Structures are given as structure tokens and as C-alpha cells.
Amino acid sequence: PHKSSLPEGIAPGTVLAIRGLVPPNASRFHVNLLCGEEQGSDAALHFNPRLDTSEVVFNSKEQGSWGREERGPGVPFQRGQPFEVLIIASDDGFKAVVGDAQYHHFRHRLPLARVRLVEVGGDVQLDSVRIF
Amino acid sequence: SNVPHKSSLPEGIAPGTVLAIRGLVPPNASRFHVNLLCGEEQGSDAALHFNPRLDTSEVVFNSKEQGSWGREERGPGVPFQRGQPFEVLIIASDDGFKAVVGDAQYHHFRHRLPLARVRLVEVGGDVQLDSVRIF
Numbered sequence: 001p002h003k004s005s006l007p008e009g010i011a012p013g014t015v016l017a018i019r020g021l022v023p024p025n026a027s028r029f030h031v032n033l034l035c036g037e038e039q040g041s042d043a044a045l046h047f048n049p050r051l052d053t054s055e056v057v058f059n060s061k062e063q064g065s066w067g068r069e070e071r072g073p074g075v076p077f078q079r080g081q082p083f084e085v086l087i088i089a090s091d092d093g094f095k096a097v098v099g100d101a102q103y104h105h106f107r108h109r110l111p112l113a114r115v116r117l118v119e120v121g122g123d124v125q126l127d128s129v130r131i132f
Numbered sequence: 133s134n135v136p137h138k139s140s141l142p143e144g145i146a147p148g149t150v151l152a153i154r155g156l157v158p159p160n161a162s163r164f165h166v167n168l169l170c171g172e173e174q175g176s177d178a179a180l181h182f183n184p185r186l187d188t189s190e191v192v193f194n195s196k197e198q199g200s201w202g203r204e205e206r207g208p209g210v211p212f213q214r215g216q217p218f219e220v221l222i223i224a225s226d227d228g229f230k231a232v233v234g235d236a237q238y239h240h241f242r243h244r245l246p247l248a249r250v251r252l253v254e255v256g257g258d259v260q261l262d263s264v265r266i267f
């Protein structure tokens with residue numbers, strides 16, 4: 001599980017840039033923006049491409065319980081295919097950009113000022129992870 | 133070559149706006165520019181003038197208000213090469229514009245004009261543009 005600590009937090013204008021490739025037999029992977037380094041920390045954002053169910057799920061997690069799921073359209077990911085993702089923070093929410101096209105806008109549910117860690121988990125091959 | 137290139141933003145940009153510019157610096161390039169301007173008319177103020185100079189091996193940053201340029205800032209060396217493709221992000225925050233070149237933070241240009249005045253992106257000079265996208 002690829003971890004990037006952000007002890008000074010993030011603000012509008014933060015860009016998480018991820019490049020990689022969906023393994024040919026992958027089921028699902030996810031990117032979490034978490035509010036602490038401890039296990040079970042709240043998730044300001046959970047971005048969950050799902051190759052098995054042909055879904056992309058966005059959610060938040062508070063005191064261990066998942067919120068209301070949001071879904072983007074279809075699935076701009078393919079097993080065996082490379083991808084490019086941007087998750088961009090603004091004052092209003094997180095903009096998920098896939099393949100050089102705006103994909104979904106997830107409005108803030110928890111305070112952005114609480115985020116302290118980026119975590120990329122699941123079945124994915126990471127070529128590059130950067131926070132600008 | 134897709135230059136001169138213009139992207140109108142009549143409603144403006146805000147913190148979290150990302151300008152993504154990909155292209156090739158062609159073999160005999162001297163310099164190119166990315167401008168964030170405050171209107172469509174000629175001589176509009178420049179909130180940001182980003183000026184990679186291949187011929188003098190520097191990158192200049194500046195602003196322009198009422199026809200007058202500010203004091204130039206310079207990044208650390210030229211992260212562009214003649215004959216080489218590039219990817220630039222110009223990222224707006226509450227504090228300024230972050231310039232990212234090829235997967236690394238290159239320079240932070242503090243706002244001199246209010247971000248809320250920007251209404252147009254122009255790209256031109258000695259570059260062969262692949263794409264300009266605003267997220």
C-alpha cells in the first residue's frame with residue numbers, strides 16, 4: 001500500500017498526480033485521502049475504480065462507517081491498459097481527471113484541512129505518484 | 133503548430149484551477165510564453181507571463197499592469213530543451229501560481245494581480261503545441 005505522508009496538510013491548489021497500469025487480472029484499486037496516520041482514520045475521499053463491477057465509486061468514511069456512494073459514468077479504466085489520473089483540490093471539492101478529461105466532481109464532505117495522508121491500495125501498478 | 137493559442141475563461145479561474153500544456157520545443161526555438169491575461173483586448177494586464185528562454189537558458193516570470201511590466205523573477209535553470217517534448221502544469225492556489233515541469237515543482241510565483249481578474253490563457257512563441265487543457 002503506497003503511502004505519501006502530508007503532515008502539513010493540503011489546500012485548494014493541491015494536485016495529486018498518479019500514473020500507472022491496471023494489471024490484466026485486477027479486480028479493483030483505490031486512492032484514499034485520509035485524515036491521519038492511524039489505522040481507521042477518516043477518509044475525506046475514497047476513489048475506487050472497480051474493474052470487476054465496471055464501476056467507479058467515490059465515498060467518504062467517518063468514524064469507520066462509509067457514507068453515500070457516488071459514481072462517475074461508466075469506467076475509464078481497462079485491465080492491461082495504462083492510465084493517468086489527477087485528483088485536484090479546490091475550495092468546493094475534489095476534481096477527478098482521468099485520461100485528460102474531467103471525470104467527476106466530489107464535493108467536500110469532511111474538511112479538506114483534515115487530510116494528512118495519501119494512500120494508494122488495491123490491485124494496481126504505479127509508475128508515478130506526485131503531490132504538487 | 134497550434135500557435136498563437138487562446139483559451140477564453142470569461143467566468144474566471146479560482147484556486148484549484150490547473151492549466152496543463154504539453155508540446156514540443158522545436159529544434160531552433162528561441163523562447164516561448166504562456167500568459168494569463170485579464171481580458172481579450174490587446175494590452176490586457178498579465179497576471180502571469182511565463183517565459184522559457186532557450187536562447188539565454190533561463191525562465192522568466194513576470195506580470196504587467198496598465199502596460200507596465202513588473203520586476204522579473206527567474207526559476208532555477210531552463211527545464212526545457214530544443215528537440216524535446218515537455219509537460220507543464222500551471223496550478224492556481226490562494227497564494228500564487230505553481231509551475232510544474234516534467235513531474236517536478238519548478239517555481240512558485242506569488243500573486244501580484246488578483247487571481248479573480250484572469251479571463252484568458254494565451255500560448256505562443258517558438259513551440260509546437262500538443263494540447264492545452266484547463267481543469
Ligand SMILES: OC[C@H]1O[C@@H](O[C@H]2[C@H](O)[C@@H](O)[C@H](O)O[C@@H]2CO)[C@H](O)[C@@H](O)[C@H]1O
Pocket residue numbers: 046048057058059066069
Ligand atoms: O463505498 C465504499 C466502500 O465500498 C465497499 O463496497 C460496497 C459496494 O458498492 C457493494 O458491494 C455494496 O454497495 O456494498 C458495499 C458498501 O456497503 C468496499 O468493500 C469498501 O472497500 C469501499 O470501497
